[PDB]
Amino acid sequence: YEHTAVMPNKVGIPYKALVERPGYAPVHLQIQLVNTRIIPSTNLEYITC
Amino acid sequence: YEHTAVMPNKVGIPYKALVERPGYAPVHLQIQLVNTRIIPSTNLEYITCKYKTKVPSPVVKCCGATQCTSKPHPDYQCQVFSGVYPFMWGGAYCFCDTENTQMSEAYVERSEECSIDHAKAYKVHTGTVQAMVNITYGSVSWRSADVYVNGETPAKIGDAKLIIGPLSSAWSPFDNKVVVYGHEVYNYDFPEYGTGKAGSFGDLQSRTSTSNDLYANTNLKLQRPQAGIVHTPFTQVPSGFERWKKDKGAPLNDVAPFGCSIALEPLRAENCAVGSIPISIDIPDAAFTRISETPTVSDLECKITECTYAFDFGGIATVAYKSSKAGNCPIHSPSGVAVIKENDVTLAESGSFTFHFSTANIHPAFKLQVCTSAVTCKGDCKPPKDHIVDYPAQHTESFTSAISATAWSWIKVLVGGTSAFIVLGLIATAVVALVLFFHRH
């Protein structure tokens, strides 16, 4: 079963949801972030000293 | 007790019904079909295969000429070629220069592969219909026996006598003339054993697989042997059976509507779904109990916890009862809004049981009976997430099964208030005639 939603961009705050498959019991769901890294692509031009 | 009703012509879907006998508790009757065969009556006209023209050895007259007689043979041809002067191994064959005669006689017969691959030409005449029914009632288990689908034959299965009624439509997938090649059948016309166009389908027609008679036109034509060698060269159009095997349409088991599987050895047409089948089953009274045997129930309240639109059993309802004593009585829904998965139930002293149903309505309004006591159920349903499934529909789809309560109220003011608005306009005319009549006196 597939469950789609929107979570906010906070690290320590868990996102809780209850998936509802028809004919079946609901299942608790918990998604939590640990890291969020933005990695830009860099190219070296020169060094200085 | 006889029970006469009608049934949709379906294979997988069972027919659930309750028999209402006065003075007796109602029993559960279930009818399920297994096969449904339409068997026409056929007679074989001829078979067809690739030909093989054998050439007998020719006579080489050295000094003279000969003639030939019309020998009885299919597509027999003859000619006489003069002045041949043939050369064999070790010098010439004859002596008379430019005065000779070669025979070159040819004759058409059927191939040795005709006993393996051939097309059989049949003419279809309307025949009989038979099927297979599964029987259970009360506490008697499932058992099956073959019946005949007509209006006359009584079939005794178990202890009950069942008469399967005739089909509501005489539709058959077969044409007047069918041709059977190997595993599959076709709807193709024949040259009817008198004709054959030498290259299409009937250039070799034999009345049975080992007939001495054989009709065959193949445009055989004998040509002149050349440059002093001994051979018989001929010329004919290629095989029409071989040409039929390439330029060939789809078979009838890939084309026939209503899901008609087509089998071979009695040439049936299995599991078609068309029309309706009436029944008449005489249930014995030995499976009937009195009113005092069954426990009456009371204080019924039914609540649908969850419903789904799909044609799996996706509706669950819980109903609480208050029975006089423990027992087992069947449940049934007489309306067509819902079908019920289980038949009987385990009763107790004021318990509650759950049953699974499958509707096709947004808001179901069906009712069901337990121990000849009715109770009304209602609720709301949600659409299913799936788009395509691998099993057919358990329910049936009606005209008003798709209308929600919001759209039902929206059409209740577009034909309710508007038609009542002309009532206001009509009575204004009816009172302006009265108020003008009173002005006179």
Distance from C-alpha of B349 to C-alpha of B342, rounded to nearest angstrom: 20
Contacts of A23 in chain B (CB under 8 A): 306, 308, 314, 316
Q: How far apart are CA B51 and CA B204, in angstroms?
A: 7
Q: Which residue of A has its CA nearest to B315?
A: A23
Q: Tokens in use for B148?
A: 């005949």
Residue A37 is classified by DSSP as -
- CA B146 to CA B428: how far, in whole Å? 72
Burial (CB count within 10 angstroms: exposed 0-12, middle 13-18, buried 19+), residue B130: middle
Amino acid in position B436: L
**B107: buried, middle or exposed (CB in 10 Å: 19+, 13-18, 0-12)?**
middle
Placement of tokens 């027992």 in the chain = B327
Q: What phi, psi does B420 have (nearest 5°)?
A: -80, -10
Measured CA distances, B206 to A5, B70, B203 (Å) = 74, 21, 10
Quick one: closest CA in B to A2, which residue? B385
For residues A8 and A30, give the distance between their C-alpha atoms in angstroms, rounded to a whole number: 13
Residue of A nearest to B309 (CA): A22
User: B380 Cβ partners below 8 Å, 6+ apart?
Assistant: B307, B362, B363
Q: Are the C-beta atoms of residues B67 and B204 closer than 8 Å to each other?
A: no
Experimental method reported for this structure: cryo-EM
Nearest to B64 by CA among B30, B37, B103: B103
Asked whether the beta carbons of residue B384 and residue A23 sit closer than 8 angstroms, the reply is no
- How many CB pairs (< 8 A) connect A and B? 10
B-chain CB neighbours of A22 within 8 Å are 306, 308, 314, 382, 384-385
3-class SS of residue A40: coil
Across the interface, whether the CB atoms of A23 and B385 are under 8 A apart is answered no
* DSSP letter (8 states) at residue A30: E
Resolution (A): 4.8
| d(C-alpha A35, C-alpha A17), whole Å | 21
Q: Are B351 and B370 in contact (CB under 8 A)?
A: no
Within its chain, how far is the Cα of B46 from the centroid? 27
Give, in order, the Cα–Cα distances in Å from B164 to each of B150, B173, B384: 7, 22, 37
Residues B328, B332: Cα–Cα separation, whole Å: 13
Of B151, B147, B183, nearest to B167 (Cα)?
A: B151
Question: Chain B interface residues facing chain A, Cβ-Cβ under 8 Å?
Answer: 306, 308, 314, 316, 382, 384-385
Which residues lie closer than 8 Å to B361 by C-beta, 6 or more apart? B337, B381, B401, B402
Q: What is the spatial distance between Cα B144 and Cα B131, in angstroms, rounded to a whole number?
A: 11
Does residue B239 contact residue B203 with C-beta atoms inside 8 Å? yes
Nearest Cα of chain A lies from the Cα of B396 at a distance, in angstroms, of 21
Sequence-ordered list of residues with C-beta below 8 angstroms from that of B76, at least 6 positions apart, any chain: B70, B105, B106, B107, B108
- Of chain B, the end-to-end C-alpha distance in Å amounts to 75
Q: Hey, is A6 helix, strand or coil?
A: coil
Distance from CA of A1 to the nearest CA of B (A): 10
Q: B4: burial class by Cβ within 10 Å (0-12, 13-18, 19+)?
A: exposed
State the Cα–Cα distance between residues B356 and B345, nearest whole angstrom.
Answer: 12
Residues of A in contact with B306 (CB under 8 A): 22-23
Using a CB-CB cut-off of 8 Å, the residues of chain A touching B307 are none
What distance in Å separates the CA atoms of residue B358 and residue A33, rounded to the nearest whole number? 42
Q: Report helix, strand or coil for A27.
A: strand
How is residue A12 annotated by DSSP?
S
Find, in chain B, the residue whose alpha carbon is nearest to that of A1: B385
- The C-alpha angle B429, B435, B438, rounded to 5 degrees, equals 140
Full 3-state SS string of chain B: CEEEECCECCCCCCEEEEECCCCECCEEEEEEEEEEEEEEEEEEEEEECCEEEECCCCCEECCCCCCCCCCCCCCCECCCEECCCCECCCCECCCCCCCCEECCCEEEEECHHHHCCCEEEEEEEEEEEEEEEEEEECCEEEEEEEEECCCCCCEEECCEEEEECCCCCCCCCCCCEEEEECCEEECCCCCCCCCCCCCCCCCCEECCCCCCCCECCCCCEECCCCCCCCCCCEECCCCHHHHHHHCCCCCHHHCCCCCCEECCCCCCEECCCCCECCEEEECCHHHCCECCCCCCEEEEEEEEEEEECCCCCCEEEEEEEEECCCCCCCEECCCCCEEECCCCCCCCCCCEEEEEEEECCCCCCCEEEECCCEEECCCCCECCCCCCCCCCCCCCCCCCCCCCHHHHHHCCCCCCHHHHHHHHHHHHHHHHHHHHHCCCC
Contacts (Cβ under 8 Å, ≥6 apart) of B275: B9, B167, B168, B169, B171
3-state class (DSSP) for residue A32: coil
Residue A31 has phi, psi (to 5 degrees) of -115, 130
Collapsed DSSP state (helix, strand, coil) of residue A20: coil
Q: For chain A, report the end-to-end CA distance as a whole number of angstroms.
A: 59
Q: What's at B66, amino acid-wise?
A: T
CB-based contacts of B437: which residues, under 8 Å, 6+ apart? none
d(CA B411, CA B230): 95
Asked if B262 contacts B244 with a C-beta cutoff of 8 angstroms, the reply is: no
Per-residue CA distances from B65 to B57, B80, B111, B221, B232 (Å): 17, 8, 33, 21, 17
**Which of B281, B288, B258 has the alpha carbon at shortest distance from B270?**
B258
**Tokens in use for B352?**
């509650």
- B170's CB contacts (< 8 A; 6+ apart) are B126
* Cβ atoms of B289 and B341 closer than 8 Å: no
